[PDB]
């Protein structure tokens, strides 16, 4: 017995994604490759955001990612900032940005 | 005492793939789970709408590929489509 995630080479669950697609009332039928594609895309996005978050965490001399690191990662990357533009991250804070005219 | 499905273990696996040394807190894991659920809902809804517009009764790899192209910005969309097509090709090859 070999899982579909193992066959596709991904870490995210293809079977769970297929069940969610079937039970979510998106269409009468769900294709075989649709869960694989969706799991791959989700894994890629998670990998990107986690790579940026870990890079932020190392800069703060901390090993564990806290929500502030995720906020810094999302806001510093323009594409992820556009993707999560209307999203508020709890305990995320804001980027340090003081306007030039206010400086002495 | 009831099952609560979550992407915690998968997010941890991906994190270990990217950063073998770093870890993640409970709030950060909850945020990541919410992010995965939100992106899943976005792509699934866009795919369902695409299928409805073309009078198709199924969600295929084409629908999700178009949904990813519509949702994600440029480089993100290109790399995501590359990853998805690699995954589907490997899945078909493994049969």
């Amino acid at each position: 017995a070999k899982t579909r995630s193992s066959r596709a080479g991904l870490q995210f669950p293809v079977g769970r994604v297929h069940r969610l697609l079937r039970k979510g009332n998106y269409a009468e039928r769900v294709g075989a490759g649709a869960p694989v594609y969706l799991a791959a895309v989700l894994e890629y996005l998670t990998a990107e955001i986690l790579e940026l978050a870990g890079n932020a965490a190392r800069d703060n001399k901390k090993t564990r990612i806290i929500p502030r690191h995720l906020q810094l990662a999302v806001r510093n990357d323009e594409e992820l900032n556009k993707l999560l533009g209307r999203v508020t991250i709890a305990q995320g804070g804001v980027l340090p940005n003081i306007q030039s005219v206010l400086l002495p | 005492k009831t099952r609560k499905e979550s992407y915690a273990i998968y997010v941890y696996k991906v994190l270990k793939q990217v950063h073998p040394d770093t870890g993640i807190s409970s709030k950060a894991m909850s945020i990541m789970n919410s992010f995965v659920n939100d992106v899943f809902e976005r792509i699934a809804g866009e795919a369902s709408r695409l299928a409805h517009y073309n009078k198709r009764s199924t969600i295929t790899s084409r629908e999700i590929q178009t949904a990813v192209r519509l949702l994600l910005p440029g480089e993100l969309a290109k790399h995501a489509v590359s990853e998805g097509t690699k995954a589907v090709t490997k899945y078909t090859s493994a049969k």
Partner: peptide, 8 residues
């Protein structure tokens, strides 16, 4: 062990 071509 995993690297993304977007940053590189």
């Amino acid at each position: 062990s995993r690297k993304s071509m977007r940053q590189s």
